[PDB]
Every structure is written in C-alpha cells, then in structure tokens.
Amino acid sequence: KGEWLPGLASPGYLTGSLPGDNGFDPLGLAEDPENLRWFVQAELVNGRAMLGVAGMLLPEVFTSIGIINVPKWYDAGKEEYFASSSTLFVIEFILFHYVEIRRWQDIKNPGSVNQDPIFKQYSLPAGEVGYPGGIFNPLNFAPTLEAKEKEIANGRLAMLAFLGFIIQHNVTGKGPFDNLLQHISDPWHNTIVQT
Amino acid sequence: SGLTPCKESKQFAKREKQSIKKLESSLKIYAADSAPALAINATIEKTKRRFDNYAKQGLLCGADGLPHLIVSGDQRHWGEFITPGILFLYIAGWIGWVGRSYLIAIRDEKKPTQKEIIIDVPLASRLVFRGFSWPIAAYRELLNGELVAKDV
Amino acid sequence: RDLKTYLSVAPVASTLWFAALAGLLIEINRLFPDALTFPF
Amino acid sequence: PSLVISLSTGLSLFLGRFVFFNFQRENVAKQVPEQNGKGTHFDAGDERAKEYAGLLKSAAAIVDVLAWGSIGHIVAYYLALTTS
Amino acid sequence: PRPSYLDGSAPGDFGFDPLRLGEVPENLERFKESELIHCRWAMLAVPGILVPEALGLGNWVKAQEWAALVPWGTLPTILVIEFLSIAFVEHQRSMEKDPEKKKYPGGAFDPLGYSKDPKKFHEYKIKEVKNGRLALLAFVGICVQQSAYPGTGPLENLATHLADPWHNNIG
Ligand code: CLA
Ligand code: CLA
Ligand code: CLA
Ligand SMILES: CC1=C(/C=C/C(C)=C/C=C/C(C)=C\C=C\C=C(C)\C=C\C=C(C)\C=C\C2=C(C)CCCC2(C)C)C(C)(C)CCC1
Ligand SMILES: O=P(O)(O)OC[C@H](O)CO
C-alpha cells in the first residue's frame, strides 16, 4: 500500500498482501517469512490495547460529572471483588490457559475450529490464522479486506495510546484524563515540557 | 544481613562527619573567596549528598559503617544488582549482536579482511539500531542462530 | 576527498569511539555522581 | 532377646531359599565373573572353589547360607540395637 | 501430532509421550505394566483415605501417627507382616511370560469372568485405566494438599465453606 518514508523504499518482505503494509521494518526483525507469520499474529493480539485502552479511558470520562462512582484504573486493585483478588487470578489464569494454547495450535495448524465436549453439534467453519469467523463474528460481517487494515491501524494507535497512558501517568501523578484535562486548562503552558 | 540500615547506623553516620571535617581542615589555609576554597566546599556538599542519598535508597551498611550490597534477588534491593544487571546485559547483548551482524554482512564477496581493519562502511547500511531489539535474537535462535558444522 | 574519510576509518576510529564513549560516561557521572545503585 | 535374631535370620534363610532364590541365581548367570583379556583365572591362578560350592542339596550352596544369614543377623542386630 | 508408536489401539492410548519415553518398544510394554500397578494401588487407596476420614479419624496422616508413639498391634509386628508377605506376592508376579500375563492375569483373578467377553474385556480395560489415572492424579492432589497437614475431606469442607478462600501460590 503506502510507504512510511518516500525514499528508502519498502522491503521485499512487505509485499502489500498483508493488511496494514507500509514498508516499515527498518531494523529487519520480520525478514524471515516464518518470522512474519508470527509477528503478524502478535500485532493483532497486542493491538486488539484497543479493548483495554478504551477500557481505562472511557470509564474514567464516564465518571466525569458524577454519573458513576468507580475508582481510577490505577486504583482498581481492591476491593473490586466479591471473592477477593487472589481468587480471580487463578480463575483468569487456568482458563485463559486453555484458550491461549488452543489459539496456539491454529498458528501452526488450523486447526481446532471444532467444538469439543459437545455431544452432537457444529464446529467453527473458517480459514485464516489471525481471524476466525463463527460466533466470533455472529453478525457474520465482511471479512474484507480493508477493515482488516482498519483493524490494524486502529490497534496500532491504541498501542501508542497505551504507551502514552502509562508514561504520562508517571510524572502527571494522576489520571490519564485529569491529565488530559489539566492540559486543557488553557494550554500553551500545559505541556510535557513542564515535566 | 546482621547489618542495620545506613539510617540507624552510628558508624556510617560517624564516617560522614569524619570525612567532612578533614576537608574543612584544608580550607582554613586558603582564605574563603579563593579558588581552592570552593573546590573544597564543592567536594563537601557532594560528600554530604552521597551520604544522604545512600540512606534514602536503603543500603544496609555493615558494622564497619559502609554500605553492603544484597544480590540474593530480594525485591527490597533489586536496584543494587538486578536492575543494573538487566541494563548491562542489554547493552552487552546489543554490542554483541551489532558486532556479529557486521562480520556476517561482510563475508559475502569483497575482501572480507579489508572491512575488518578499515570499516569505511559505517554501521554498514544501518546496523547499529538493529541492537535496539537484539533480544529478538531469541527468534533467530529457533532458526539459525548457530551453525551446524560442528556438533549440535 | 574520499581519502580523508577512510583515513578516519582505521583504528583511529577506536580512539574517536572511546573518546566519545568516555565523554558520555564522564558527563553521566557529572549529572549523577557517586552512583552505587539504580533507584527508579 | 536372642529370639529376634533367629526370627530374622530365619526369615531371611526362608526368603533366599524359596522366595528370592531364582532371581539371585538368574542375575549371577548374566553377570560374572572377571575380564582381561577375558575370564580371569587364566593367570592369577585363583580360581574357584567348586567343592564348597558343591551342595548335595536340591539347590542352596553353603555360601548361600553364610551369605543369606549374615544379612539376617545384621538386620537382627539392627533392630535389637535400635530399641535401646 | 501423534507419535509414531502410539497407535491408539492400546488401552488408554491418547497420544501422550512428550519426551518420547516409550519410543523403545520392549520398555513401552514395561511402562504399560508399570502403569496399571501404580494405578491399581492408588485406586485402592483413595477410598482408603477418604472413607475413614468420613467416619471420623483426623485424616490419613493422623491415621498413621499411632505407630510413631490385637492382633500384632505393634509397628514391629506389622512391619514384618507387611514385609514378608508383600514380598511373597510380588517377586512371584514377575513371571515375565506374556507381558505379566498380558498384564492382565485373569484366571482366578477374574472369578466373575469379565475377561471371557471379547469387546467387553477391551472396554473394561480402557475404563480401568482412565479411572486409575484419575486416582493417581487425586493422590497427588491429596499429597500436595496434605502437605499443609490438615484434611483431605476437611479441605473440601473449607472451600465448600467459601469460594472466597484463595490459593494465590507462587503461584
Ligand atoms: C506488538 C506490537 C506490534 C507487532 C507485533 C507489530 C508487527 C508488525 N508490524 Mg507493526 N506497528 C506497531 C506495533 C506492532 N507491529 C505500532 C505501535 C506502530 C505504529 C508506528 C506500527 C507500525 C507499522 C508499520 C508502518 C508497519 C508495521 C509492520 C509490521 C509487520 C512487519 C514488521 C515487524 O515484524 O514488526 C516487529 C515487532 C516488534 C519490533 C515488536 C517489538 C518492538 C519494540 C520492542 C517495542 C518498542 C517499545 C517502545 C518504543 C518503548 C519506548 C521507546 C522510548 C524511545 C520512549 C509486523 C507484522 C509493517 C507491515 O508491513 O505490516 C504488515 C509495516 O510497514 N508496523
Ligand atoms: C476492555 C477493558 C474494559 C472496558 C471496556 C471496561 C468498561 C466498563 N467498565 Mg470495567 N474494568 C476493567 C476493564 C474494562 N472495563 C478491568 C480490567 C477491571 C478490574 C476489575 C474493571 C473493573 C470495573 C469496575 C468495578 C466497574 C467497571 C465498570 C465499567 C463500565 C463503566 C460504566 C458503567 O458503570 O456502566 C455503563 C453505563 C451505563 C449502562 C449507563 C446506562 C444505564 C441504563 C440505561 C440504566 C438506566 C438508568 C436511568 C434510567 C438513567 C438516568 C440517569 C440520569 C439521572 C443521569 C464500563 C462498561 C463499572 C461497571 O461495571 O458498570 C456497570 C464498574 O462497576 N469496571
Ligand atoms: C483429583 C483431582 C483434584 C480435585 C478434585 C481437587 C480439588 C480441590 N483442590 Mg486440588 N490439587 C490437585 C488435584 C485435585 N484437587 C493436584 C494434582 C494438585 C497439585 C498441583 C492440587 C493442589 C491443590 C492446592 C494447593 C489446593 C488445592 C485445593 C482444592 C480444593 C478446592 C480449591 C482448589 O481446587 O483450588 C485449585 C487447584 C487446582 C486447580 C489444582 C489443579 C487440579 C486439577 C486441575 C483438578 C483435577 C482435574 C480434573 C479435570 C477435575 C475435573 C473434576 C473431576 C475430577 C471431579 C478442592 C477440594 C485448595 C484447598 O486446599 O482448598 C481448601 C488448595 O489451595 N489443590
Ligand atoms: C537469577 C539471578 C542469579 C542467578 C543466575 C543464574 C544462576 C542463572 C543462570 C544461568 C545460566 C546457567 C545460563 C545459561 C546458558 C546457556 C547457553 C547455552 C548460552 C548461550 C548463548 C548465546 C548463543 C549467546 C549468543 C549471543 C547473543 C544472543 C548476544 C550477543 C552474543 C552472541 C552474539 C555471543 C543470581 C541469583 C546469580 C543473581 C540474581 C539474579
Ligand atoms: O497510518 P497512521 O498515520 O495512522 O500511523 C499509525 C500511527 O503511527 C499510530 O498507529
């Protein structure tokens, strides 16, 4: 597709077949095709940030006027539990454990599309490692093609967005949104330059 | 860890006072307003400062009155070895990975030794930053980080 | 003028590199002297 | 009491003779006895020892007797010593 | 995928040997025999440690403290009996003719004749293992749990009491 810099030029590995291709691999990590197929998966799973960054941002701005009285994202350690914290990790771990390995196989051989315990029923019908249709897409949207590039691009910004959140928190000692609104206190003086 | 922290230390505290008095003894012969004066006083504030900082960051200090580092891995004292250690290996690998990447690029064609004594090839095309992500050499390991000529 | 560059690309490179490295290290020590640990 | 000795020495003899006898002998066949060169005895003129090994009994040599019993006594003393 | 030797026809064979432990055939038959026995002792035992606890006996651990401090109610007495006997049986079982009686001795050991059946004998087998592997796992669960020294059952009671108690662990 496009190019991140007009000169220098895209590498041969960056054909454009992949959604979100812009010829940006100055270092050269993804040069071995096996290397890409793995980093392609990592970019999607990391990218899909989005879920979280929106998860730490939006509830912070829903508690803007006093609609909800929930603690900050960096204060939600306790007691956000009807079962205490240490209960939840194990539950989160054990089962995520299960989902993650199954997801793992599809990267090497697709796969595990079928249901399991189920006595007499269907299985996922799909193709492509990074994106599995099925209830994963109950609406049955369009696995196109551009969105696949939309998906990425939004995930990439979210990533940078996360990196922003955590850093900014440090120094700006408080909320990435207070932050956001401390800047708005007529900026032009409210810059990171301050810190 | 029979050591009691540099804060509640009487020896390490005494050692601070001993050092600055000796420095103060020296400025008495130069007359303030003079050069050797600040240099001595600038040395004194640095002395007070380093003693002040060591007590802040923890540092246990033995009976001798000097800080002893703990490298057991204790979370309370990670900054004494692990965190600087992680920083070292990062730079240590980075150098290792950049150097290896160079000799590899040189080998095909040319006179390879020409590039070794003279490197009018700087970072080759752009090899240095490649080290920013050296740890991804773990993925080079699963493929061909090693040659199969001798043993496995 | 190709010649001067190469000239600067022999073991001298090492001196320039180590001079630049020393300068960096010393200046780092000026801003942060008496460093027995990494506390952040 | 001396009784502990005999009971244990007694059981051992029983075991070697009936319960474990086959296994022992089996291992020995697949094992001995010396090599050089090969076979020892060829030089170092010593060298079994067939007679004492000879036993008109349906199996158990005398050596076996000494061998099995000794283990038994050790155990007996082991226990006898131990209680005190 | 599936290892080359693990066909699937074997009783309890689901394709698991990540370290290729049974790649060598004559020892794979050795391990298969070793499995049931480990399985047989264990299955016998778990009930052994649960029912007594159910009747009330401070768990299997306290069950064993008596020796530490009729008929033959003495550690010395019992030990010899446990010893000489468990020796008689076993190191007799060795037979090593037709994989320890095909690993299924049958005969007198099948007084009720479930071995006679063709397919039932095989389905009976796969059932026996799976239950067995289940025990082995349970035993380990019990051991790890008991390593804190309270109760295999009482443990259930404690969790049952509340889902709130948390293991954490290292974790
Ligand atoms: C997990 C995150 C992640 C992953 C796995 C990928 C993976 C990929 N990218 Mg992507 N990218 C990302 C984030 C990511 N990207 C972000 C946030 C941006 C915005 C700049 C981009 C912009 C981008 C462009 C323009 C292109 C790609 C492309 C690619 C593909 C080829 C290059 C490659 O192998 O990447 C290697 C994976 C890594 C290098 C992961 C580790 C990176 C380091 C360790 C993180 C740095 C942290 C941060 C800088 C710390 C602070 C620094 C300090 C100075 C403040 C590959 C699928 C190329 C493509 O063709 O897409 C198909 C393409 O041209 N990416
Ligand atoms: C993907 C990351 C992610 C995302 C997207 C979210 C998103 C959200 N979180 Mg969450 N969270 C996360 C991660 C994330 N979280 C993590 C990792 C933790 C640690 C556990 C938490 C812990 C947490 C807690 C403790 C809570 C949340 C809550 C919420 C919701 C906040 C808004 C709300 O109260 O309900 C949404 C707002 C509405 C539904 C408004 C409409 C209400 C209807 C229409 C009723 C009508 C009432 C009346 C008629 C309206 C008139 C009112 C008028 C007077 C103004 C929001 C969906 C809060 C929540 O659970 O929400 C219920 C809250 O309790 N999170
Ligand atoms: C027979 C299998 C089995 C069963 C039924 C249990 C049951 C229980 N365990 Mg145990 N456990 C097991 C095996 C098992 N465990 C093994 C093999 C280990 C060694 C790692 C442990 C280590 C362990 C610890 C440290 C603790 C328990 C605790 C508990 C109790 C509830 C809390 C809990 O489970 O935390 C979660 C523990 C695990 C998830 C360990 C993994 C065990 C496997 C996944 C369960 C069996 C697998 C199988 C698919 C189960 C399906 C159900 C069916 C078998 C009935 C509950 C009675 C807790 C307790 O003491 O509460 C009072 C406690 O903290 N277990
Ligand atoms: C933790 C810790 C500790 C410990 C440690 C240890 C003990 C460990 C270890 C370790 C080990 C025991 C390791 C090993 C190994 C191995 C091998 C086998 C190797 C390798 C390698 C390679 C291959 C490399 C390569 C490269 C790179 C990658 C970089 C650059 C260089 C080159 C290029 C050279 C202490 C406690 C002390 C301290 C604290 C922390
Ligand atoms: O294509 P862009 O301009 O949205 O580039 C992506 C940003 O650098 C962050 O995702």
From TrEMBL, chain C:
> Which Gene Ontology BP annotations are present?
photosynthesis
Report the membrane topology from the UniProt record. Single-pass membrane protein
Q: List locations, semicolon-separated.
A: Plastid, Chloroplast thylakoid membrane
User: Origin, by domain of life?
Assistant: Eukaryota
Instruction: Enumerate the UniProt keywords alphabetically.
Output: Chloroplast, Membrane, Photosynthesis, Photosystem I, Plastid, Thylakoid, Transmembrane, Transmembrane helix
Residue sites binding chlorophyll a per the record = E27, R30
A family per Pfam: PSI_PsaJ
Write out the transmembrane intervals: 5-26
One GO cellular component term noted in the UniProt record for this chain: chloroplast thylakoid membrane
Show the InterPro entries listed in the entry: PSI_PsaJ, PSI_PsaJ_sf
Would the keyword Repressor turn up in this protein's UniProt record?
A: no
Q: What does this protein do?
A: May help in the organization of the PsaE and PsaF subunits.
Name the record gives this protein:
Photosystem I reaction center subunit IX
What species is given as this protein's source?
A: Pisum sativum (Garden pea)
